[PDB]
Amino acid sequence: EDWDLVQTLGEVQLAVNRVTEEAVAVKIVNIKKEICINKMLNHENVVKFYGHRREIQYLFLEYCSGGELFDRIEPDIGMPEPDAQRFFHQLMAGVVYLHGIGITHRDIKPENLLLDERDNLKISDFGLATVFRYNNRERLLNKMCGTLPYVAPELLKRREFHAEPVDVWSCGIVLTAMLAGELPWDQPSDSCQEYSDWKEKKTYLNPWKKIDSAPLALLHKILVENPSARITIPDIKKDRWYNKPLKK
Numbered sequence: 001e002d003w004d005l006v007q008t009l010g011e012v013q014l015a016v017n018r019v020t021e022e023a024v025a026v027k028i029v030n031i032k033k034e035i036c037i038n039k040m041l042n043h044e045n046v047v048k049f050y051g052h053r054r055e056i057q058y059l060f061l062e063y064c065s066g067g068e069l070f071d072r073i074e075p076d077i078g079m080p081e082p083d084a085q086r087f088f089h090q091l092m093a094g095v096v097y098l099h100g101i102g103i104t105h106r107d108i109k110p111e112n113l114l115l116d117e118r119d120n121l122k123i124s125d126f127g128l129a130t131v132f133r134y135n136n137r138e139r140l141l142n143k144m145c146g147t148l149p150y151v152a153p154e155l156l157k158r159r160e161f162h163a164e165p166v167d168v169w170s171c172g173i174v175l176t177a178m179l180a181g182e183l184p185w186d187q188p189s190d191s192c193q194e195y196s197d198w199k200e201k202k203t204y205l206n207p208w209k210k211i212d213s214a215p216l217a218l219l220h221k222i223l224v225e226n227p228s229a230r231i232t233i234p235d236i237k238k239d240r241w242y243n244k245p246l247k248k
């Protein structure tokens, strides 16, 4: 029952059980909603929730000893393509799970993708998450949420938008970062030159130039401005690169 707070992780601290030496990440601090959503979650690519205690609120979450995805990405380089595909497969498994229970994360980015001791990816931090489907009825979102370089263009231009294509978009930005070690634009607006260049298909420029034609073809289907025309996850699962055997 007793835990030693060993060190700050980033507040979030590492706790180690006095008896078992099992480790847990303790988050100290909307929060009521974060707990409610966490209580719903159980999937191998989602950070585990062990429970909470009110004292200051404590959330007891999975300690992922492999660190954050951010740290497997070499600036301006990315990571080996087979590694990126594996992480991407795991990301999709996690997102499919969340969307299946009607939850959208709304802030997918490498800082929120942690790695366990076997480098299995875990989606982390449900502080911005919300319900988008309940009793089989979808509700459109309208709140501004996320992180600009990862946010889908419809959030900036539309009053309401579907939740699922927004998470799909951010996963595409994550994939870009894994494959090129750089983010494509400050934000997806017409005022953003890099974004305009993408819309005009200038893929001879960075970061696209660094990306092989197969994963780039997938990115062409994900980073589509019209969310209604944007590829869905069941179709990502049928993508050629997605299903390409890769070996380091």
Ligand SMILES: N#Cc1cnc(Nc2cc(NCC3CCNCC3)ncn2)cn1
Binding pocket: 003, 015, 022, 023, 024, 026, 050, 051, 060
């Ligand atoms: N600090 C602190 C703290 C952490 N977990 C608490 N409750 C738990 C903890 C827990 N941990 C079990 C796993 C077992 C495998 N290794 C990581 C921990 N399972 C269920 N409830 C209570 N207080």
Ligand SMILES: N#Cc1cnc(Nc2cc(NCC3CCNCC3)ncn2)cn1
Binding pocket: 009, 010, 012, 025, 027, 047, 061, 062, 063, 064, 065, 066, 067, 068, 111, 112, 114, 124, 125, 126, 127
């Ligand atoms: N919300 C939330 C959350 C934060 N850290 C968790 N576990 C960690 C966290 C960690 N480093 C601190 C994180 C690193 C990513 N940005 C937020 C703080 N290292 C190992 N395991 C689990 N859930």
